Structures are given as structure tokens and as C-alpha cells.
Amino acid sequence: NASICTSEEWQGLMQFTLPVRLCKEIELFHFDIGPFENMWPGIFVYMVHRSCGTSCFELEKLCRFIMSVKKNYRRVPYHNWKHAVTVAHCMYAILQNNHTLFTDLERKGLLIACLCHDLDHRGFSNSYLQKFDHPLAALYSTSTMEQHHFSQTVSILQLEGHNIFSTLSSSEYEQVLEIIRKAIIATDLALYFGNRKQLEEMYQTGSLNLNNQSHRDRVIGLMMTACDLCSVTKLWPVTKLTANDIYAEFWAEGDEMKKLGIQPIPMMDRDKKDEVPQGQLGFYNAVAIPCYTTLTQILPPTEPLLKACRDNLSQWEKVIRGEE
Numbered sequence: 001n002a003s004i005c006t007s008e009e010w011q012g013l014m015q016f017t018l019p020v021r022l023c024k025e026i027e028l029f030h031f032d033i034g035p036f037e038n039m040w041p042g043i044f045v046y047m048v049h050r051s052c053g054t055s056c057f058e059l060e061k062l063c064r065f066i067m068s069v070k071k072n073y074r075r076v077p078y079h080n081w082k083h084a085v086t087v088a089h090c091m092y093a094i095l096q097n098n099h100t101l102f103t104d105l106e107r108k109g110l111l112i113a114c115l116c117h118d119l120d121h122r123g124f125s126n127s128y129l130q131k132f133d134h135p136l137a138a139l140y141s142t143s144t145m146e147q148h149h150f151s152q153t154v155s156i157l158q159l160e161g162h163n164i165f166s167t168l169s170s171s172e173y174e175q176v177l178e179i180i181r182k183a184i185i186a187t188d189l190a191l192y193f194g195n196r197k198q199l200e201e202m203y204q205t206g207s208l209n210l211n212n213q214s215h216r217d218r219v220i221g222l223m224m225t226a227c228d229l230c231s232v233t234k235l236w237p238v239t240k241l242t243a244n245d246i247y248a249e250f251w252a253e254g255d256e257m258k259k260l261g262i263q264p265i266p267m268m269d270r271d272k273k274d275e276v277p278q279g280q281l282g283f284y285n286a287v288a289i290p291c292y293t294t295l296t297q298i299l300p301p302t303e304p305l306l307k308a309c310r311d312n313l314s315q316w317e318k319v320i321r322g323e324e
């Protein structure tokens with residue numbers, strides 16, 4: 001159905017001014033939004049205006065949208081409002097460093113898709129919902145949550161005074177929603193592996209062409225994964241703290257499986273905390289390093305994301321060796 005923000009919430013956002021010392025900070029890939037909670041809605045407005053312009057969206061409509069988007073996130077340990085803004089910030093840094101490669105419609109679509117990508121998340125994986133016949137898995141067979149997140153995105157845009165894309169042409173509005181839809185779906189990690197493998201082959205053979213739409217869609221997809229997994233690109237102390245949140249949500253899912261007499265995978269088992277550093281080595285080796293390596297090849301200015309991920313891989317290797 002989607003929840004609406006209050007008049008007080010959106011009007012408070014309209015008046016927000018980002019402190020000048022942070023304008024330079026937000027441009028960095030390693031930027032951590034963590035210590036500026038009150039500013040997160042305002043940080044998103046700032047990023048939208050810098051990337052798309054102050055004339056791109058009607059200020060009141062944009063403020064209503066952000067605040068209603070904020071309300072439609074649940075108070076789960078990881079897949080919350082904080083994660084939405086963190087993923088949107090990383091997209092802003094990628095877009096800013098590759099400005100002319102993407103259209104005005106892609107830049108507005110991607111930043112919106114990133115803030116909306118995990119809308120109404122329940123703290124449960126797709127496999128869990130499918131295994132326990134949850135109504136969301138009956139409605140959406142594959143990429144269960146991701147289809148629900150896009151359904152929630154459309155629902156918020158269809159609220160009163162929330163359609164931030166109304167001023168686009170009928171063809172452009174259709175285009176923007178398709179951009180948002182493919183971007184949200186791409187955040188399903190199960191789709192990433194095949195997507196990155198296709199991109200690798202295209203890059204190595206020299207057949208990758210950003211003029212080709214299917215290629216573009218695949219590049220956008222990898223950008224989505226790269227933003228979604230960005231906690232691995234922060235400074236070590238931030239990366240550790242976000243892992244705690246990721247695991248707290250995983251262990252609660254594992255607890256639900258145990259209550260139903262099902263042993264969860266070690267990742268979702270709170271009695272298997274000792275296995276985490278090896279699980280992180282495996283995740284960096286087969287997921288994060290390949291992701292950021294392919295991203296840096298396609299978009300060389302995204303190199304600092306790979307550099308930070310490689311530093312965090314080094315820290316996890318240091319944990320294993322007994323140097324933590």
C-alpha cells in the first residue's frame with residue numbers, strides 16, 4: 001500500500017543545508033554517512049542536485065518522496081534506511097567520476113533506484129521466503145524481494161505529490177521506470193555472478209560497447225552490485241561495524257530457521273561466529289574482488305573502490321593469521 005510522510009517531515013528537509021566541510025567529503029568513495037544521521041535525507045537531496053541539477057525535480061515533490069521512502073524502510077539490523085543512503089552515496093561517487101558516460105535520465109533513475117532498492121525489506125533472504133511458502137514468494141517466483149522493492153518504489157511515486165517524474169515525456173517516464181526496474185532486480189546477488197562473467201568475456205574480447213543497450217544494462221547491473229556491497233570499500237573500522245549489522249540480520253534469519261527445526265547455513269548461525277573471517281575471505285575472493293576488478297576495468301575512475309576492497313581483504317587475511 002506504501003506509507004506517506006508527514007508535512008513536518010518533508011518541510012524540515014526543504015530547509016536543510018549541508019555543512020560546507022562535508023561537500024568535499026561526500027565526493028570521496030570511502031565517505032561514511034554513518035556519523036551524520038539527521039543529515040541522511042538532506043545528503044540525498046544534495047547528491048541529486050549536484051548530479052542532476054536543482055531544476056531536475058520540483059523541491060517539494062523530491063522532499064515528499066525521500067521522506068516517504070524513509071518511512072517505507074523497516075527497523076531491521078541491516079537492510080534499513082542507513083543502507084539505502086549508503087548505496088545511493090556510492091552511486092553518486094561512481095556517477096560523479098564518470099559523468100558523461102551516463103545520460104541525465106540514467107543518473108536520476110540510478111540515484112532513485114539506489115535509495116529504493118531495498119524498500120520494505122523484512123530481514124529475510126529470497127531463499128527463506130521461497131522455502132517457507134511466504135506470500136511474497138507466491139506473488140514473485142524469482143528475485144522475490146527485488147520485485148517487491150520495485151513494487152514499493154512504483155507505489156510511493158503513485159502517492160499524492162510524490163511523482164517526481166511526472167514532468168518527463170511519456171517515452172522518458174517509461175524509460176526511467178525501466179532503468180529503475182532493471183537496476184533494482186540487478187541487486188539480487190544471485191544474478192550478479194552470471195552478469196559479471198558476461199562482462200568479463202566482453203571486456204577481454206574487446207566486444208563491450210556502451211552504445212549497445214544490453215551491454216549498458218549489464219554495466220548498470222554491476223554498478224548496482226558495487227554500490228550494494230560498498231561496505232567492503234570503507235575504511236577498516238567502518239567495514240567491521242557494518243559486518244556486525246549484516247551478520248545480526250543473518251543470525252536472526254538463522255534463529256527463525258532453528259525455531260522451525262531447520263539448521264541454517266553457517267553464515268546465518270550465531271553459534272558459528274568463529275567461521276566469519278573465513279566466510280569473509282571466501283566472499284572477498286569470489287564476490288567483492290571480482291566485482292570491483294571488472295568495474296575498474298570498465299570504468300577506470302572507480303579504481304578507489306577496488307583499492308579499499310583489496311585493503312579490507314588484507315585486514316581479513318590479517319584476522320585469519322592471528323593479527324586482528
Ligand SMILES: CCn1nc(C)c2ccccc2c1=O
Pocket residue numbers: 189229231232242243246267279280283
Ligand atoms: C559482510 C560483507 N558481506 N558478507 C557476506 C558473507 C554476504 C553474503 C551475501 C550478501 C552480502 C554479503 C556481505 O555484504
Ligand SMILES: [Mg+2]
Pocket residue numbers: 117118145187188
Ligand atoms: Mg536487496
Ligand SMILES: [Zn+2]
Pocket residue numbers: 083087117118187228
Ligand atoms: Zn541492498
